[model samples]
Target: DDKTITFWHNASAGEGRQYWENLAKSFEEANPGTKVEIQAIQNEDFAGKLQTAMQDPASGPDVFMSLGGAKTKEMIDAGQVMDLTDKISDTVKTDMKTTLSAATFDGKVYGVPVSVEPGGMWYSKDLFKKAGVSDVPATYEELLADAKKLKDSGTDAIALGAKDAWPAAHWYYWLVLRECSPEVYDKSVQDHDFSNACWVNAGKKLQELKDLKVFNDGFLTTTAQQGANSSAGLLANHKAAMELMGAWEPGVLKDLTPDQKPMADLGFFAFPEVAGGEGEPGALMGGVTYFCVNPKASQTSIDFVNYMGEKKNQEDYAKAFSTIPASEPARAVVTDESLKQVIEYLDKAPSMQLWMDTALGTNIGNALNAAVVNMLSGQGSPEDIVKAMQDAAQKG
Candidate 1:
């Protein structure tokens, strides 16, 4: 029987989509008898589609993108992912040593990380000048003040794609990273406990940002990466002054801009320090997008998963996505200014947390994300957000 690697990823546009197509072509050439079938799914649609597909081996992809954390753990608990502990290549073992921890559960590797994306503030240098903001915000107070200044300058201060939910939830996630102590944060994820005051406080902080009236008009209806009007698109075209996003924002923005090239005024800063918070000032939160194989997938799928970790492939992936590659050897080739700043922040961060949603797993994570959106839209409250998480956890 002919072996085919059925692969799926959330990279449906521009360079990222092209990167996968080319990668599959090369992989097919390298393994003459094996075929590679690629599917580029939209980001928001990918998870639901993958979850539905995973129920049946016949419908599931042989290999697919996996954001390692509680989500990967959930997949493993269901026996949906292959155990790659013994299959990992030397390149992955050494070059991806640090990030491999994200994909490892119970001392077994389950995925191959392609990038280490730390979330932060992406801004427009020119927009800041237009708004008469002299320096990037260094604290939560300054951030609010700057938001007002930018709004007064007649441009949206923040581009939020609330319709996508996750983009809106990211505001709360970063707030959680700022407000929650390391121990509380870890316990919340590990034990599914949301009792800590810091969790609700994070929602209150997000509410503060919401009350600022600085987000783009109609933001609740806007998507995150879809088109010119999406949050990244709003920043790409200078319709907004700021956005909080993962390091991949640069590549996403590039594809949305008028020139279809990197945004010249693109800038980045770590999430600002929050006063009265127990968490460390420079802590970070993000996730590694990795490739994992179906338990029943052939060796061809396993080989390609490790192939993604090779130094050359990692460097190319970094260039194509304008994000940090998992392979340490490929780090030097990253030249995106904003992503470079993200890399520096990642390197020096006192601690790093996975994206809260990923760490919390699917059911609870979805509840948390939707609750933030409801709170922002006046349908719920900060307390309600925490309640939603608790209820979801209990249900599970």
Candidate 2:
């Protein structure tokens, strides 16, 4: 049998890309008679692209990134994902013990865990000081007021990569986390029930931010992190003050910066609390980035992702991506102060929802995200966001 593995990852630039390239070469070198093909896809385009490619197992990637949740379940249901229950290395079983659960469905492991990222607001400390934001915001009103201050200081107060759609929907996701109770949030996600007023309220709250006119100009077309001009790039270069993104943000910004190092002024805070909301005060939303092997892939592909699970590789993965690694032993290598705060918030959060799109499955999740993007673009309404999800559910 030909021992070649085709690997697809959403690390399209700089060190993120370099890490996988290096790892792939190493995998080849370490294992004689093995060859690995690499395809680095942009984050925003990876999902739909992979889904389309997965329709035929023979031509699809042998190993690929998978966000474990409803999305991974769908892949598993379709037999696109490999069952790694007995095939993975013992090292993977031990180091990734806790985080492995996310990639496990029906008590069987389908993927190898890499990083568990919790979303929040990433900001530049210098920009905050320059904008006279004496304190990080604690309430939604304060956050909006701070955006105004940052705008008045002549910077894009918010860097929204709405062109990707998911980044834009993130604002609404966090708001929904704040506006709905944990019970209601679970019900809505699990049952596809959006009858709760909080669903629409989340949109109105996000709309409040949208009306502030604080996002980077041309934000509607701005990509998330393709180059120096993307949302994270704007923040990296000091053209924007803040971004609401996952913990992986620091890693993404590090590559975009001129010096190719962690941004010195990088800072992070939990998303602000919304007043009069029924949700838990410390609720958060995030998920792990994992890699799944195609059931059609050879043993080489399985070995590749298992190699990614090794402690040494996991540590380097964290260093390269500038994000938290899933392996428990690899966590100590995390030195970024901004990421440290994110870890603290994650530790204290009373509830943590996987990114809604991941939690709700592809069809409904895509609909919700599209609706939010449409709303932000002035082509839809908050009510429409809920209606989109309801409509998608009805298609079943």
Mind giving the per-residue lDDT tens digits that candidate 1 earns over 307-390?
899999999999998889999999999987777778887778766788888888888999999999999999999999999999
For model 1, the local distance difference test gives: 0.89
- For every model shown, what is its TM-score relative to the native structure? 0.98, 0.96
RMSD of model 2, in Å? Answer: 1.5
Q: Clash pairs of candidate 1? A: none
Tens digit per residue, CA lDDT, model 2, 230-327: 99999999889999898889888988899988888998888899999998887878889889988888878888988999888999999999999999
> Top TM-score: which candidate number?
1
The per-residue C-alpha lDDT of model 2 at residue 150 equals 91
lDDT of each: 0.89, 0.88
Tell me the lDDT of candidate 2: 0.88
